[PDB]
Design a binder for this molecule. Structure first.
Ligand SMILES: OC[C@H]1O[C@H](O[C@@H]2[C@H](O)[C@@H](O)O[C@H](CO)[C@H]2O)[C@@H](O)[C@@H](O)[C@@H]1O
Ligand SMILES: OC[C@H]1O[C@H](O[C@@H]2[C@H](O)[C@@H](O)O[C@H](CO)[C@H]2O)[C@@H](O)[C@@H](O)[C@@H]1O
Ligand SMILES: OC[C@H]1O[C@H](O[C@@H]2[C@H](O)[C@@H](O)O[C@H](CO)[C@H]2O)[C@@H](O)[C@@H](O)[C@@H]1O
Ligand SMILES: OC[C@H]1O[C@H](O[C@@H]2[C@H](O)[C@@H](O)O[C@H](CO)[C@H]2O)[C@@H](O)[C@@H](O)[C@@H]1O
Ligand SMILES: OC[C@H]1O[C@H](O[C@@H]2[C@H](O)[C@@H](O)O[C@H](CO)[C@H]2O)[C@@H](O)[C@@H](O)[C@@H]1O
Ligand SMILES: OC[C@H]1O[C@H](O[C@@H]2[C@H](O)[C@@H](O)O[C@H](CO)[C@H]2O)[C@@H](O)[C@@H](O)[C@@H]1O
Ligand SMILES: OC[C@H]1O[C@H](O[C@@H]2[C@H](O)[C@@H](O)O[C@H](CO)[C@H]2O)[C@@H](O)[C@@H](O)[C@@H]1O
Ligand SMILES: OC[C@H]1O[C@H](O[C@@H]2[C@H](O)[C@@H](O)O[C@H](CO)[C@H]2O)[C@@H](O)[C@@H](O)[C@@H]1O
Ligand SMILES: OC[C@H]1O[C@H](O[C@@H]2[C@H](O)[C@@H](O)O[C@H](CO)[C@H]2O)[C@@H](O)[C@@H](O)[C@@H]1O
Ligand SMILES: OC[C@H]1O[C@H](O[C@@H]2[C@H](O)[C@@H](O)O[C@H](CO)[C@H]2O)[C@@H](O)[C@@H](O)[C@@H]1O
Ligand SMILES: OC[C@H]1O[C@H](O[C@@H]2[C@H](O)[C@@H](O)O[C@H](CO)[C@H]2O)[C@@H](O)[C@@H](O)[C@@H]1O
Ligand SMILES: OC[C@H]1O[C@H](O[C@@H]2[C@H](O)[C@@H](O)O[C@H](CO)[C@H]2O)[C@@H](O)[C@@H](O)[C@@H]1O
Ligand SMILES: OC[C@H]1O[C@H](O[C@@H]2[C@H](O)[C@@H](O)O[C@H](CO)[C@H]2O)[C@@H](O)[C@@H](O)[C@@H]1O
Ligand SMILES: OC[C@H]1O[C@H](O[C@@H]2[C@H](O)[C@@H](O)O[C@H](CO)[C@H]2O)[C@@H](O)[C@@H](O)[C@@H]1O
Ligand SMILES: OC[C@H]1O[C@H](O[C@@H]2[C@H](O)[C@@H](O)O[C@H](CO)[C@H]2O)[C@@H](O)[C@@H](O)[C@@H]1O
Ligand SMILES: OC[C@H]1O[C@H](O[C@@H]2[C@H](O)[C@@H](O)O[C@H](CO)[C@H]2O)[C@@H](O)[C@@H](O)[C@@H]1O
Lengths: 109, 109, 109, 109
C-alpha cells in the first residue's frame, strides 16, 4: 500500500500503489512509476543487474541495492538518523518525509 | 484515507481510517482514535464546543479550531514552513512527518 | 478488506472494513457491524461461546461456528453450490451476492 | 475502488483498481485489464469510437456504450432484474456476481 516505512524494503516485484498509480521495484533492477501502462519516471537502472531490492533507510536515504548489496542508485537524502516515510501520493508525486515530529504513541508490538 | 496532507482539513464528522483504526474529528469537538469501538487516545476537548475542524498546517502544527476559528488544542509542533503529512499508520500510531526531503516531481494540477 | 470470498473464513478477531465501517467476528462469538464505535447490527450470539469462526461457504450460506464446529447462527441462504461473495459496501449494507455469472478468466494460482 | 455496483457507470478514463491491477474504460473505447503495464484482457473495441461509457446494469449485463448510446460490446449476462456487482478481485479475475441473496439492511440514503 501507498507507504514504505523506514526500516522496510521492497523485494523484487514488490510495489506501492495508489489508485491507477504503481511504483515498482522491477526484477530487471529498474524502479519505475507507472500511470496505468505509461512510465512517467524511473531510476533508469534497467539491465544494470538482476533481483535488486529497494530500501527506505533510517538515515533518510532511499536506495536501490544489487543482490550483492552494492548501491546502484540513491536519492542522496542520507542525513539524520530517525523515522521516515516514502509516500506514493494521491496527486501522483512520490515524496520522502521525515523525521517524525509528533506521535500519539499508540503503536503495538 | 490514511493521510491528512498539509493544507487540508477535516470538517466535522470527517476521518482518517486504516483497517480497524479510525481517527475522527467528532462533532462534539473531541478528536479521537478508535480501535474498533474502543477509544485509545483523544484530545479530551469533548463538549468544549460544537462543529470544530481539524487543520494540518504548513507550519507543521496540527490544530483543532472552533467554528469561530480560535484554537482549542494543538500538537505544538509549529515550526518551519513546508510540506507535512499526518499519517494513521498500520501499527496504530498517528504520526506527523516533514518537511519533504526529496520528490520525483510528477504531481498534477 | 471489504470482501469475504466463498471458501474463506474469518478467525477470532478478524474483520472486514470499509471507511469508518467495521464488520468483525469478535472473540466472544458475537458478529457485529460498527459505524465507528456504534454497533448497528449483530448476530446477538455474544457469550454463547468463545473463539468462534465465520465461514462464507460455497453453498452460499454465511455461518458462525463454535470451536467444536457446531453452527450457532446462519444467514439461511444455503442453496446452490458455486462461488459467492459477502461484501461490506460503501453505503453501509452487508450483502451476499452469487453465483458468479461471468468472468474474464484471468485468475492466478 | 474494486467494485462497480449495478446502476453505476464508468465514464471515459474512470477505472477499477486492486493492488497492481487496473480495469479501465479507455477514451479510445477499449476496456482493458492491466497487470502493471501489461494488458492481460480487453474487449478489443479500441478505435471503434470515442468517449464510450461502461454500464453495470440492473438486468445483470455489463455493457460498453458509444456516446450515442448504442451498445458496442456486452457480457451477454442480461437476465433477471436485481442488484449485481462487478468485482476486480485480489486473484486478478474480474467477475460479475448476483442477484443479492441476503443483506443486513443497514444502508443509508
Ligand atoms: O532519463 C533522464 C531522466 O532524468 C530523471 O529522473 C531522474 C533519474 O531517474 C535518476 O537520475 O534519478 C534522479 C534522482 O532524483 C531522477 O529524478 C527525470 O528528470 C526524467 O524526466 C528524465 O527522463
Ligand atoms: O523487459 C523489459 C521490461 O519492460 C518494462 O520495464 C521497462 C524497462 O525497465 C526499461 O525499458 O525502462 C522502462 C522505463 O523507462 C520500463 O518501463 C516492464 O514491462 C518490465 O516488466 C520488463 O522487464
Ligand atoms: O549511514 C551510513 C549507511 O550506510 C549505508 O548507506 C549509505 C548512506 O545512506 C549514504 O552514504 O548513501 C549510500 C549510497 O549512495 C548508502 O549506501 C548502509 O550501511 C546503512 O545501513 C548505513 O546506515
Ligand atoms: O515516534 C514515531 C515512531 O514511533 C514508532 O517507532 C518507535 C521509535 O522509533 C522509538 O520509540 O523506538 C521504538 C522502538 O523500540 C519504535 O517503536 C513507530 O510507529 C514509527 O513508525 C514512528 O515514526
Ligand atoms: O486524559 C489524559 C490523557 O493524556 C493524553 O493524551 C494527550 C491529551 O490527549 C492532550 O493533552 O493532548 C496531548 C498531546 O500531545 C495528548 O498526547 C494521554 O497521555 C492519555 O494516555 C491520557 O489518558
Ligand atoms: O455523545 C457522547 C459521544 O460519545 C463518543 O464520543 C466520546 C466523547 O467525545 C467523550 O466522552 O470522549 C470519549 C473518549 O475519551 C469519546 O469516545 C461518541 O460516540 C460520540 O459520537 C458521542 O457524541
Ligand atoms: O505561523 C503562524 C500561524 O498562525 C496560526 O497558527 C498558530 C501556530 O501554528 C502556532 O502558534 O500555534 C497556534 C495554536 O496553538 C496556531 O494557531 C494560523 O494563522 C496559521 O495559518 C499561521 O501560519
Ligand atoms: O516537493 C514536495 C511537494 O510537491 C508538491 O507540492 C509543491 C510544492 O509545495 C512547491 O512546488 O509548490 C508547488 C505549487 O506551486 C506544489 O505543487 C506536492 O505533491 C506536495 O504534496 C509535496 O510535498
Ligand atoms: O435483537 C433483535 C435484532 O434483530 C436483528 O438482526 C437479526 C439478528 O441479528 C439475528 O436474528 O440474525 C438476523 C438474520 O438475518 C439478523 O438480521 C435486527 O432486526 C435488529 O434490528 C434487532 O435489534
Ligand atoms: O466485553 C463485552 C464486549 O463489548 C463489545 O461487544 C459487544 C458484545 O458482543 C454484546 O454486548 O453485543 C454488543 C452489540 O450488540 C457488542 O458491541 C466489544 O467491546 C467486545 O470487544 C467486548 O468483548
Ligand atoms: O451443504 C451442506 C453443508 O453442510 C454444512 O453446512 C450447513 C448448510 O449450509 C445449511 O444446512 O445450514 C447449516 C446451518 O444452519 C450449515 O451448517 C457444512 O457441512 C458445509 O460444508 C456443507 O457444504
Ligand atoms: O468463474 C468465477 C470464479 O473463477 C475463479 O474460480 C474458479 C472456479 O471456481 C472453477 O474454475 O474452479 C477453479 C479451480 O480449479 C477456480 O479457480 C475465482 O477467481 C473465483 O473467485 C471466481 O468466482
Ligand atoms: O482477441 C481475442 C481475445 O478473445 C478474448 O477475450 C474476449 C474478447 O475480449 C471479447 O470477445 O469479449 C469476450 C467476452 O466474454 C472476451 O472474453 C480472450 O479469450 C483473449 O484471450 C483473446 O486474445
Ligand atoms: O493510443 C493507443 C492506446 O494504447 C493503449 O491502449 C491499447 C489500445 O486500446 C489497443 O491497442 O489495445 C491495447 C490492448 O489490447 C491497449 O493496451 C493505452 O496506452 C491507451 O491509453 C492508448 O490510447
Ligand atoms: O432489459 C432491457 C435493457 O435494454 C438495454 O439493455 C440491453 C440488454 O441488457 C441486453 O439486450 O443486451 C443489450 C446489448 O447487447 C443491452 O443494450 C437498456 O435499455 C437497459 O436499461 C434495459 O434494462
Ligand atoms: O438488498 C440488497 C440491496 O440493498 C440496497 O438496495 C435496495 C434494494 O435495491 C431495494 O430495497 O430498493 C432499495 C431502494 O428504494 C435499495 O436501497 C443496496 O445496498 C444494494 O446495494 C443492495 O444490493
Amino acid at each position: 500500500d501507498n507507504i514504505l516505512y523506514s526500516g522496510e524494503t521492497l523485494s523484487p516485484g514488490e510495489f506501492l500503489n495508489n489508485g491507477r498509480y504503481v511504483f515498482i521495484m522491477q526484477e530487471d533492477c529498474n524502479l519505475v512509476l507507472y500511470d496505468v501502462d505509461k512510465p512517467i519516471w524511473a531510476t533508469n537502472t534497467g539491465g544494470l543487474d538482476r533481483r535488486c531490492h529497494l530500501s527506505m533507510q533510517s538515515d533518510g536515504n532511499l536506495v536501490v541495492y544489487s543482490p550483492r548489496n552494492n548501491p546502484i542508485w540513491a536519492s542522496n537524502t542520507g542525513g539524520e538518523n530517525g523515522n521516515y516515510v516514502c509516500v506514493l501520493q494521491k496527486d501522483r508525486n512520490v515524496v520522502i518525509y521525515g523525521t517524525a515530529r509528533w506521535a500519539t504513541g499508540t503503536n503495538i508490538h
